[PDB]
Amino acid sequence: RKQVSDGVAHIHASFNNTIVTITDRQGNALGWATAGGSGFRGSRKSTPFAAQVAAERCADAVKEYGIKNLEVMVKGPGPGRESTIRALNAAGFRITNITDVTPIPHNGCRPPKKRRV
Amino acid sequence: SLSTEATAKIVSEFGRDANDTGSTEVQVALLTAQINHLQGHFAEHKKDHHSRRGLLRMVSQRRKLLDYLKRKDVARYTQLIERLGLRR
Amino acid sequence: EIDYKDIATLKNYITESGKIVPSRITGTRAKYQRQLARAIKRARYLSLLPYTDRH
Amino acid sequence: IKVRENEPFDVALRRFKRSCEKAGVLAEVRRREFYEKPTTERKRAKASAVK
Amino acid sequence: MRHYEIVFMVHPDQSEQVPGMIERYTAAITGAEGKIHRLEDWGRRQLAYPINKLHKAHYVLMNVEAPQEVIDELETTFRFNDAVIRSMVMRTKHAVTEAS
RNA sequence: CUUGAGUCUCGUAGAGGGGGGUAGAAUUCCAGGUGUAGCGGUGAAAUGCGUAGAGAUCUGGAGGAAUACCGGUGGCGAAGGCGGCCCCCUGGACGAAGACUGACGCUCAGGUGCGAAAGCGUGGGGAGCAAACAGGAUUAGAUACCCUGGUAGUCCACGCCGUAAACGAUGUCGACUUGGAGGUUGUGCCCUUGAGGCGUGGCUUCCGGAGCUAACGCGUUAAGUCGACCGCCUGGGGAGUAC
Ligand SMILES: [Mg+2]
Ligand SMILES: [Mg+2]
Ligand SMILES: [Mg+2]
Ligand SMILES: [Mg+2]
Ligand SMILES: [Mg+2]
Known part of the structure; x- marks a missing residue:
């Protein structure tokens, strides 16, 4: 609808869920997808396959923008960390730059105790 | 600690003469310096x-x-205290 | 390694990420490593070197 | 960790992320801190590294 | 009287002040028995990171040997000079001169 | 008198202390753009947050706390403890060419001071984490573990509290007694033409001999062999309780 031909793809590789948001090099989101919404939930939405069906689904929503190339912004561990990228490129997307933007504080806030069993 | 100058300076006013820094009077005086300066x-x-x-x-x-x-x-004791005004 | 403005030297003692390389890997002595760390750190503060890759 | 390789050959090159940053730095911060546990549990590795 | 390796970087669009600044700083030092041992003008230079907008600064050296009093006075001015940004200053370590 | 102890000279390493600045990463919050139906969480869930537009993403702003990497079997400190960078003020330790003093030393009941965390008072601060508390869940029950929130507190100044598995569970000082491998720092010699090799002081890891030990183990940094001073123990419970 605006024709960008080349933007960027962000991937929220969270230990529980994975969402992909395609947006121009500016930041303005063009479309997004998420494993949780791509069907399976919980025990099944947190798998590597999840991000696949999600990422590919994010394209069938923004590809309508005449996108050709696109960089990748990966942040966070868990599955769909790499899976998402593959499917993305495998969709014809002319990849270019793959950079990890995972947050890593030089010793700042205090992480939560949590998990104790 | 104390400046090399202020040191040699005091080593003379109380030192048995010079070049010597072991003199009891000297030490005592030298200490009082930092003690007071601190x-x-x-x-x-x-x-x-x-x-x-x-x-x-x-x-x-x-x-x-x-x-x-x-x-x-x-002797030296009583005199030493006088110049440094110590012992209450 | 002794000076900070010598970015040309410190770059060798820094990974591609920006963080200084370990002492065991480089082999450099400990005494030297410490002196290097300080130069590198203050060098980054004068924007003569990067903190990480992003900025 | 930036990766921009000229000439399209879709090669991930995940070595960088898996060379320092990424996991290991995140999994390390996931749960609580450490406090006293690090000065030991971590230094308890040298007791192993030795032999 | 001690030594310091003062290095200050000024805003790019303030380059014309760089020279004027130096003369004043230098004069202030020598004025009180100062003793400059290195005056390098690296001029405009790309920044490792965009330290508060703009990725190009204007670095300058000093390595001047003078009493803490004046160098301290100088440190403050840097804060009351919107033109100048970052500023670092180390101690003696035996007067340095040349290279860099 | 000079070998103990100390002073001076010159060097050396250091997260030693007090004060004041300051930098980058990140979290959260506020505002706005893009964007659309989920996000978040778990073993699943649910509470919760979403169409009053979240999450994601981008931009700008506010603020508090802690300083990735370096980093270590590391270093400094009486102990407690002390990690970004810079300045100011300041303590101790070590080596060595030596110079100086001349037993000025060791220990120490009472005494004086320093004391983690939590806690207390006054006034600030408050992002993250989190006793209490409130929900959701699990369970037979679940005043818990888990999830969603969240107050004190955690941060600062000044005053108090004086405790800890305040642990090497090993008082301090000094002298002797096979060796091996390594770390850190000072210094001397060596075509140093070298990464370097050899010595030689300080501090420090692991292994181990004699010897010691009930055994485990300790083992020149002893729990071996000795001397000086101090602290403490005398069966378990009751009780570090009562008065
Ligand atoms: Mg909780
Ligand atoms: Mg407290
Ligand atoms: Mg309080
Ligand atoms: Mg020690
Ligand atoms: Mg042994």
């Missing part, structure tokens, strides 16, 4: 305990040098 550093900050530890070591030590001097020769 009062300023401690008058401020205060919570600087670790540094105080060093301070006291100088006092307690000087107390011995002085006490010792008195035993080896009351």
Whole structure:
């Protein structure tokens, strides 16, 4: 609808869920997808396959923008960390730059105790 | 600690003559310098305990040098205190 | 290694991420490593070197 | 960790992320801190590294 | 009287002040028995990171040997000179001169 | 008198202390753009947050706390403890060419001071984490573990509290007694033409001999062999309780 031909793809590789948001090099989101919404939930939405069906689904929503190339912004561990990228490129997307933007504080806030069993 | 200059300077006014820095009188005098000069550093900050530890070591030590001097020769002792105005 | 403005030298003692390289890997002595760390750190503060890759 | 390789050959090159940053730095911060546990549990590795 | 390796970087669109600044700083030092041992003007230079907008600064050296009093006075001015940004200053370590 | 102890000279390493600045990463919050139906969480869930537009993403702003990497079997400190960078003020330790003093030393009941965390008072601060508390869940029950929130507190100044598995569970000082491998720092010699090799002081890891030990083990940094001073123990419970 605006024709960008080349933007960027962000991937929220969270230990529980994975969402992909395609947006121009500016930041303005063009479309997004998420494993949780791509069907399976919980025990099944947190798998590597999840991000696949999600990422590919994010394209069938923004590809309508005449996108050709696109960089990748990966942040966070868990599955769909790499899976998402593959499917993305495998969709014809002319990849270019793959950079990890995972947050890593030089010793700042205090992480939560949590998990104790 | 103390400036190399202020040091040599005091080593003369109390030193048995010069080049010598072992003289009881000298040490005592030398200590009183930092002891007094530090009062300023401690008058401020205060919570600087670790540094105080060093301070006291100088006092307690000087107390011995002085006490010792008195035993080896009351003369030098009485005079020494006068120039440094010590012992209450 | 001794000076900070010598970015040309410190760059060798820094990974591609920006963080300084370990002492065991480089082999450099400990005494030297410490002196290097300080130069590198203050060098980054004068924007003569990067903190990480992003900025 | 930036990766921009000229000439399209879709090669991930995940070595960088898996060379320092990424996991290991995140999994390390996931749960609580450490406090006393690090000065030991971590130094308890040298007791192993030795032999 | 001690030594310091003062290095200050000024805003790019303030380059014309760089020279004027130097003369004043230098004069202030020598004025009170100062003793400059290195005056390098690296001029405009790309920044490792965009330290508060703009990725190009204007670095300058000093390595001047003078009493803490003046160098301290100088340190403050840097804060009251919107033109100048970052500023670092180390101690003696035996007067340095040349290279860099 | 000079070998103990100390002073001076010159060097050396250091997260030693007090004060004041300051930098980057990140979290959260506020505002706005893009964007659309989920996000978040768990073993699943649910509470919760979403169409009053979240999450994601981008931009700008506010603020508090802690300083990735370096980093270590590391270093400094009486102990407690102390990690970004810079300045100011300041303590101790070590080596060595030596110079100086001349037993000025060791220990120490009472005394004086320093004391983690939590806690207390006054006034600030408050992002993250989190006793209490409130929900959701699990369970037979679940005043818990888990999830969603969240107050004190955690941060600062000044005053108090004086405790800890305040642990090497090993008082301090000094002298002796096979060796091996390594770390850190000072210094001397060596075509140093070298990464370097050899010595030689300080501090420090692991292994181990004699010897010691009930055994485990300790083992020149002893729990071996000795001397000086101090602290403490005398069966378990009752009780570190009562008065
Ligand atoms: Mg909780
Ligand atoms: Mg407290
Ligand atoms: Mg309080
Ligand atoms: Mg020690
Ligand atoms: Mg042994």
